[PDB]
Amino acid sequence: VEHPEFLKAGKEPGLQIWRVEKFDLVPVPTCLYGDFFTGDAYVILKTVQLRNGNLQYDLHYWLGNECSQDESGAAAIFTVQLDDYLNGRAVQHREVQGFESATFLGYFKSGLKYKKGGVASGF
């Protein structure tokens, strides 16, 4: 995909977070990393550099308890598309609010926060 955010994904070790907003992938301001709108869906790419220097990719789509079906659907599809764009090298992980994996919770050094609301459905 020619998605402009794809061109930025997975270049260096670190965390990148996009929110689904009306059928598009929109980057989250870095200062908001870790506060999730429970009414929204997100795509999180974690890039780890191994001891070799080689890049490893884990791709999490995070689903708020109140996100609309278009948001959770787009998050899943965007995840597949980014994985495909990354030559299939990402391991994909479905993250549900309240039930995230320890690996995912571990990405947030001061612990992730939930907050109500979010961006309106694209439907």
């Binding site: 020619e2 659907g73 787009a74 599809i77 598309q81 994909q92």
Partner: protein
Amino acid sequence: QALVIDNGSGMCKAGFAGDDAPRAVFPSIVGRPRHTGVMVGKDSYVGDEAQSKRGILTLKYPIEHGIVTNWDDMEKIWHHTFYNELRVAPEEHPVLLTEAILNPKANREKMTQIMFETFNTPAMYVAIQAVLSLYASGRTTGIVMDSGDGVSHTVPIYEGYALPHAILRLDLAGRDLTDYMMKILTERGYSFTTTAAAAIVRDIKEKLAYVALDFEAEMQTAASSSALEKSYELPDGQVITIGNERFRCPEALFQPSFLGMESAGIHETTYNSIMKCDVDIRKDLYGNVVLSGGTTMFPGIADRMNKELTALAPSTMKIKIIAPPERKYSVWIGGSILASLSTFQQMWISKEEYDESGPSIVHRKCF
């Protein structure tokens, strides 16, 4: 403004990408005259109108078990969809269409050809129906149990893509269930004799049937009490009582022997598909069993799938059955979402690419 068309054996679902439900759902039926030339109006009717005029038409279904078998009639279905149902000019809209799993290569080409050459679509895409249902459920990995009017499938999908080797097909679906219900109500003592008989029995199935958690125990309750019985008003106003037929009819999904078939039931087909997959992904399939289609609409079906898969898998396996109320149109909704994505304009086959490559482009763009 993209269009989304989900063509099924029994029903066509059509609408506009960005809508949360199909705008139009109509029977996938083309009616043609029994006798040509002698009466006003070769010549054809589609959907509800064809059904209405069925006494003077030969009615045909262009789709059998999810696969197109009559291209002339399929073309009538699409023309009606565009012009009569959606009221659009197809040359003005990208079109998303859906296909069955293992849709033959020549069929995918013919659909592409018809869209670009007959309908002059500026752009089209073909998506696999089960994968669309999975996406609708906010998942990229899971097993979809798709049951419609002419066919059932179990489709394992991993990280966005079906695993073709693991796919299983059951030729038992809603049409078989409606027939079975007719049969068992007839045996009870009822007689469905008018032209409206198939629709009456189908309606009894859609309104009153359910899947029993414990079948033998329900048979017991039903034999010993009247607690499970429901009344049903016929068109003429006669009221009949529906007893054990309510759960015996869908029981045939779990016991195809009810229908004279040797095949495995839906719970076993699901398990068999899972066991054809790499051991490392099975736990994610069991944890993400997505039900999809009209024939998954019976109350109690999810609880029964959970129970049956629980009995088949190791006792420590986490089994989750996902059966949202809107699962009748999951495929359509997944298409709506896909076709709305900011990235969809790079997915589609454009008219320009079709002109340069012809129909075999579909195999390179759509998978």
